[PDB]
Structures are given as structure tokens and as C-alpha cells.
Amino acid sequence: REGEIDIAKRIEDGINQVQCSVAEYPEAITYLLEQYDRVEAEEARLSDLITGFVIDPELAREKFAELRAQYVVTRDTIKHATAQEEILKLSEVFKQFRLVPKQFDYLVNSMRVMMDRVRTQERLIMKLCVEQCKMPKKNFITLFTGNFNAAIAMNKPWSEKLHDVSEEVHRALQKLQQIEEETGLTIEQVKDINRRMSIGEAKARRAKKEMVEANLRLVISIAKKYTNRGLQFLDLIQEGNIGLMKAVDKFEYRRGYKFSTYATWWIRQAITRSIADQ
Amino acid sequence: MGHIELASPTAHIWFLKSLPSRIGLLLDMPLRDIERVLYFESYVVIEGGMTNLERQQILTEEQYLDALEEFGDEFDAKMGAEAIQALLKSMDLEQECEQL
Amino acid sequence: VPLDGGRFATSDLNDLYRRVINRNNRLKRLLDLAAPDIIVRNEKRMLQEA
DNA sequence: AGTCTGACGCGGCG
DNA sequence: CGCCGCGTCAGACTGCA
RNA sequence: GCAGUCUGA
Numbered sequence: 001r002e003g004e005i006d007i008a009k010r011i012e013d014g015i016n017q018v019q020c021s022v023a024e025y026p027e028a029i030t031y032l033l034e035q036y037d038r039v040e041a042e043e044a045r046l047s048d049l050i051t052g053f054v055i056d057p058e059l060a061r062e063k064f065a066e067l068r069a070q071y072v073v074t075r076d077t078i079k080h081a082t083a084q085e086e087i088l089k090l091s092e093v094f095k096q097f098r099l100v101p102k103q104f105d106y107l108v109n110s111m112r113v114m115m116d117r118v119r120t121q122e123r124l125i126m127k128l129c130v131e132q133c134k135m136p137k138k139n140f141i142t143l144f145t146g147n148f149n150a151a152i153a154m155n156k157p158w159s160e161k162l163h164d165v166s167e168e169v170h171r172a173l174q175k176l177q178q179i180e181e182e183t184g185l186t187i188e189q190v191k192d193i194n195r196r197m198s199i200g201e202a203k204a205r206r207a208k209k210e211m212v213e214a215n216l217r218l219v220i221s222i223a224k225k226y227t228n229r230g231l232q233f234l235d236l237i238q239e240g241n242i243g244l245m246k247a248v249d250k251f252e253y254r255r256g257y258k259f260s261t262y263a264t265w266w267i268r269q270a271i272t273r274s275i276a277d278q
Numbered sequence: 279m280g281h282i283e284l285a286s287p288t289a290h291i292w293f294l295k296s297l298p299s300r301i302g303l304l305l306d307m308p309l310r311d312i313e314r315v316l317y318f319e320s321y322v323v324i325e326g327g328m329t330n331l332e333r334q335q336i337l338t339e340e341q342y343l344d345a346l347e348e349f350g351d352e353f354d355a356k357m358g359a360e361a362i363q364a365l366l367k368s369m370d371l372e373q374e375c376e377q378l
Numbered sequence: 379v380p381l382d383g384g385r386f387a388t389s390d391l392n393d394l395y396r397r398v399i400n401r402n403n404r405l406k407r408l409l410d411l412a413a414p415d416i417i418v419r420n421e422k423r424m425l426q427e428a
Numbered sequence: 429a430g431t432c433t434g435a436c437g438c439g440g441c442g
Numbered sequence: 443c444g445c446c447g448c449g450t451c452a453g454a455c456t457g458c459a
Numbered sequence: 460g461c462a463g464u465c466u467g468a
Contacts, residue, residue: 441444441446455464
């Protein structure tokens, strides 16, 4: 099972990477400082909010007071490696939170939709340009990594064609600025960190797609025995495979088991129940 | 008559395979690559965005994962009939004919 | 039409339609079970082929 | 999908 | 190189989902 | 309802 460990360590590398990448968002600190106080006001519970740390609510109180003190020193680091040392310190305390699955899911899809917030503008401006300009797009890449607040006179004939859209372009600058100020962060940094978490999840899913073909043997062998229960081989393999997938995200690989030896505990759960359904 | 609500989009074979392929001729994309797209043998980017990926460019399996590392979510590519439906719905008919 | 032997005389469409309705139904399973991509790819391709 | 498969045609055409 | 076609009508008998 | 075969003009 040494290949299993090679895969699982890259999995945990990817999840550490997405954790430290989402940890860079400062408004997540406000969110969690609301969350823990909802717990402390008996309207929420920590067992649904935090599973562990890197259980006691007093250590959580300590950590959340640390995170509040880190958010204030995030506020005063307006100055730009001065913010970088502080954001690394904030990631230091953030990576010590083994958050509940659903809460982290809320966080990551929140990051996804706030990335989409700038995504819509970055797309629509392009569809406005690419219709009529025949433009120096290869240099629009540079122009947009920079940020039309200054670039009107592009000294070509198409510098007139941008005047057909310039009003809607400036409206797009207004919306871009309002979304830029709403997050309290530079849009470029958000693009980078969202790229980072996307790459972490992509690498994890990659290794998952290697793993599924690595572990077809157990599901094939169990389905081959379960054929006679009134179903085909070709859907019992699906039940065993999705059971394996459920086993993936909950395998404590440091336990020394072969992961296959785990999946059966759910494959039996997945097949014998599916025979009940079909 | 009845109707089956297909869980996913599906390319009509009469407009894809009857030669000359209407889907390909409309998209200006050769038939041999459209077959690879809507039979899950390749990808195609519905939009490149701020990325050197042309809207009609096909990508093989690992290139999609590779172009992820290089550009993240700046571009967007799909496979199967969803991608072809997106490429179809995305195009501007009257602008395309006035340009051609 | 039901035949004398009990085995119904069937037009081929009733099979082909059936061949679709299974796989689409099967696909409707996986969209609810959040199955991995490598499985739903094969299922969608089988649906398209049907 | 394994076949202890077939192919064992042609002529025109896009 | 893939796709399109390659007469009409009638009778009989099997076998088959 | 179809396929296969044979046959007829």
C-alpha cells in the first residue's frame, strides 16, 4: 500500500494548500468571530462549527481570542510585505482549525461566489471588446494585470472604436471598484489565492482519479460475489465505487490500514442497501 | 406523444453526423474533433478569458489539468454535449454572418 | 402485441427507448449521489450512444 | 464485451 | 475515405422476440 | 410485425 501513502500524502498536501490559501481571506476572520460568538450565546454549537484543532471549548475560546487579536493587527497592517508578515501570522493560527466539513464548505463556496463576482466583469468587458476592436488583446493581458481609468488614447484607429463602449467600460470600472472595495482586498490577490485553492483541489482530484483505478480490484471482487442477488455486475460495481468514494474523504490514512480494507465496511453498506433499492 | 427529460444535454446525431455536419459547419470546427468532444475524448474551452486559449481550441485530457495549473479558473472548459451546447448558445448569429 | 407463446411481439423502438430510459435513469442516480467524474463520464457517453 | 466474429461488393461523389 | 444507392409483384415454408 | 430460404412472371 505504499502507493496509497504516496497518494494520501499528496492529498493532505492539497488540503493543507487549500486551507492556507483560504486562510488568507481576512473577512473569514469576521465570519468565524461571529460564529464562535453564536456558539457562546447558546444559539449555535461548536461540534457543528469546529471538529478539532492543529474536544474543549476553552481552548477554542483562547484560539478565537487569538484570531480576534490577529484581526486587529491585520487591520493596522495597511502597509506591501508589512501586510504579508501579518497574513502569514494569520494563516499560522488559521491552520490550527480542523473545521467542520459543512462550515468549510460554506467558506469555500463563499470564496467561489466572491471570485465569480469579479469573474462576471472580467468576462463581460472581454465580450464587449472582442466584437469590434480587433484589439491588442495580447496587451490587454498586461493592461488588466495592471488594474481605461488612464488608458483611452491607445494611438491606433481602434482607439476610436473603444469610444463606442467607453461609457459601459467606465460603468464596468465602477462595478469593479465597488467589488474591489467590498472585499477590502486587491482583486489580483484574490485571483491568485483562488487559483491556489483551485490547484489544490485539482491535484487532490487528480490523485483521486488515479486512486479509483488503483482500487478497482476490491469493488470488482465484491461485485463478482454479489452478482447473484438479483442485479447485474455492472451496477454493483457502481455501488461499490461510490462507497469507496465515501470511504476516501473519511480515511485516517495514518492508521496503518490498507484503504481497501476500509472501503468494504461501506461497500457492504453500499451494495446490500442498493439491492434493497433495486 | 411523450417526452423524456434527459438528465444531461445530448447532441442530435442527425445534425452532427449527416455530412456535411451542420454542427461543425456552424461552429467552424472540424467534425473529427467534435466527435472527440461530445464523446468525452477531449475538452473544449467555452471561453479563454484572459488566457491564450481560443474559444474553439480543443484540449486533451491531461492538458485540461495542465492548463488548470497555468491559469487556474481564468478559462473554462467542458466535455460532452454540454460543451457543444454552450458553444452553440454562446455565438452571435447576425454578428457572425455580417463578419463573414 | 401479446403473442400466443406469451413472449410479446415487440417493435425494436420499445427496446431502443428502453435502452435509453435505463441509462438516463441511471444517470439520474449519479447526479444525486455526487459520483466521481470518471464514472459519470462513462454514463453520459453511454446515454449519448443510446 | 469476448467473439474459437468478418471480409468474402461496386461505382460515384463530396 | 466515408456515405449513398443497387426493379416490381406474388406464393410457400420455417423461426422468433 | 420481422428475418431467412425457395419459387413464379
